[PDB]
Amino acid sequence: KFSLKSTDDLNKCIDHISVLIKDAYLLYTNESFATSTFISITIIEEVGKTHIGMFLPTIKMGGRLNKAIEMIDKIVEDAETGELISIRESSLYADIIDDILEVPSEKISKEQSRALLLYAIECFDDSLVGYTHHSFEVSETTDELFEKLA
Amino acid sequence: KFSLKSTDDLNKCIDHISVLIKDAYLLYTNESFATSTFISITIIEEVGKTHIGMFFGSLPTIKMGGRLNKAIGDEMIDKIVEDAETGELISIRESSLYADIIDDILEVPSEKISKEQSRALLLYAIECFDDSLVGYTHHSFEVSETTDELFEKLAN
Ligand SMILES: [Br-]
Ligand SMILES: [Br-]
Ligand code: NA
Numbered sequence: 001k002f003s004l005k006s007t008d009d010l011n012k013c014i015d016h017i018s019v020l021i022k023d024a025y026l027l028y029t030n031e032s033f034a035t036s037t038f039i040s041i042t043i044i045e046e047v048g049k050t051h052i053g054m055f056l057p058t059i060k061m062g063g064r065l066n067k068a069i070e071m072i073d074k075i076v077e078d079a080e081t082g083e084l085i086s087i088r089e090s091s092l093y094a095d096i097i098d099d100i101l102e103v104p105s106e107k108i109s110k111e112q113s114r115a116l117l118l119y120a121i122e123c124f125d126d127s128l129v130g131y132t133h134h135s136f137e138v139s140e141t142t143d144e145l146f147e148k149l150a
Numbered sequence: 151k152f153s154l155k156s157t158d159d160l161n162k163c164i165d166h167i168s169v170l171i172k173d174a175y176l177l178y179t180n181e182s183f184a185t186s187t188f189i190s191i192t193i194i195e196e197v198g199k200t201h202i203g204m205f206f207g208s209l210p211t212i213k214m215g216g217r218l219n220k221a222i223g224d225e226m227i228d229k230i231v232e233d234a235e236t237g238e239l240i241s242i243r244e245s246s247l248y249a250d251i252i253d254d255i256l257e258v259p260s261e262k263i264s265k266e267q268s269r270a271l272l273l274y275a276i277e278c279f280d281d282s283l284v285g286y287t288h289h290s291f292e293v294s295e296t297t298d299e300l301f302e303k304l305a306n
Binding site for chain 1: 184
């Protein structure tokens with residue numbers, strides 16, 4: 001379906017994912033933890049679609065993602081499971097779970113939002129930063145926003 | 151599938167729709183027109199699910215002097231209405247968040263959704279909420295005061 005033919009195509013997807021990261025960050029800051037989280041899980045599946053379009057990033061362990069959030073194992077497990085899909089659903093859409101009404105603001109925690117954005121940014125960084133001059137420019141904003149969330 | 155059995159359920163949904171409106175406005179007001187629009191279209195779909203839930207369906211009834219009529223004009227209302235009837239609003243929603251290869255040229259949200267489109271869809275979504283759900287519960291009127299303000303700001 002989706003295959004990138006050019007270094008310009010990769011820079012377009014880089015740029016777009018920078019927008020989602022700025023929007024996920026903007027939402028987290030304004031305490032919209034559930035909507036932020038929805039955009040955070042989108043980035044991780046969009047980063048994965050881009051990497052595959054050119055033809056998961058193994059935790060550093062001791063690296064800035066550990067020192068900032070342990071909880072990594074959790075997100076990686078939910079990601080492998082297919083559980084991150086249902087967490088994303090529940091982070092934007094209200095739902096009758098069996099016969100109680102469930103709502104985004106009471107399914108996503110401030111720290112869950114913080115962790116998936118920090119994880120999304122690493123997803124993008126480990127996957128795409130390094131393959132163009134442009135990625136390096138972008139990574140310094142990605143870095144500034146990452147550091148600010150710690 | 152989705153039904154609501156109490157005014158507590160309705161108000162919780164109403165509150166959630168208030169969150170999405172604030173979020174679409176937050177994004178728009180930054181300059182993330184595309185992500186905004188994804189939320190604005192979601193709001194229109196989740197107002198319908200909710201209205202129907204208590205019984206793109208519930209489109210606002212347009213009146214000649216109406217605040218929306220005033221903020222975006224007759225042409226545009228008609229356009230959004232047609233996009234909702236034919237399901238163009240779903241493709242617009244997909245294109246406002248997800249990169250795509252169409253014909254064989256990479257498409258990105260920033261190049262599909264204009265400021266003008268983003269503004270009109272949030273105003274429109276806000277008027278969906280208001281027409282469909284405000285009046286049902288005493289709490290809805292409280293939330294309408296917030297949504298009314300966001301509406302006033304966006305239309306000037
Ligand atoms: Br470059
Ligand atoms: Br009352
Ligand atoms: Na009404």
